[PDB]
Amino acid sequence: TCPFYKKIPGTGFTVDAFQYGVVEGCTAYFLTHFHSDHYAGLSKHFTFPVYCSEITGNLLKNKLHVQEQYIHPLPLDTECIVNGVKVVLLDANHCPGAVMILFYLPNGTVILHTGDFRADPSMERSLLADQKVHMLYLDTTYCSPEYTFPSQQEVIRFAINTAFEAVTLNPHALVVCGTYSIGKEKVFLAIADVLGSKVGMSQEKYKTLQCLNIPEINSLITTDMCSSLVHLLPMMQINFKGLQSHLKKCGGKYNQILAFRPTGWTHSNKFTRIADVIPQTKGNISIYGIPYSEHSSYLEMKRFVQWLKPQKIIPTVNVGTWKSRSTMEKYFREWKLEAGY
């Protein structure tokens, strides 16, 4: 049964609610982004209207085989009427195709559902600027002050400089980057650009990348592993055993691997600056964990909410424990007292 924080009161609508069967009263199912915890339940047999971005729609059709007649893509930054209710989709600064949804309820209430997001000051000049929001359904993944990490630009700077140094010292080194979902494509694209290489990957991952509307993508990626010196592999294979086994398959072309695991936050963030990060090494294999996040830091989240000044907040992440829920409620009250709304 569908939980309350996935329902939009005063409408026929749900958000990211595909794993509960036929939801009673639901006339349109919104999908914020193509990540498995959110799409869980969709398949080619789904027969209700799905509303989403163009990119999410490409993935639904090609990867999950949802039939075209049930896919309803909407442009961003554009007022649209859905089953008699005005909606707007906004870029969520998460993975490709990820949106926030603004719902203008027939009674005058305005609701923002962030989906998953990485808050940014640029959002303060979107269509959010123009009116008041009563209810915020908020991605609270990192809602605690211990969660710090650097900008995405600092992280990419570190990775580019690391890869270019290693391969210039040793032209026979291979770079490998882990992946298990869409998102974080800048990591592998930036490294391949500095090295003058295409990114090599499986047929299944190439298929997924071809759904994302990235400019000039045919110039950047390939299924011909032999022609490429940046390879993508499943995240599960980014360990000493998995990488040893991959180096065997490369036909003595390479004699060293430098690999990247983009994670979210890890507790080595509490002590170490990005500049100071070091790898784990065994023989001719080195593995860097790099803190590339597609969710808001605590400070970014706090800034956004203090700017928006919502009347009520409904968390969508970490809602399963009493300790979590109490911690989050305390920070929301601090923020409101500090800012005066």
Ligand code: NI
């Ligand atoms: Ni996500």
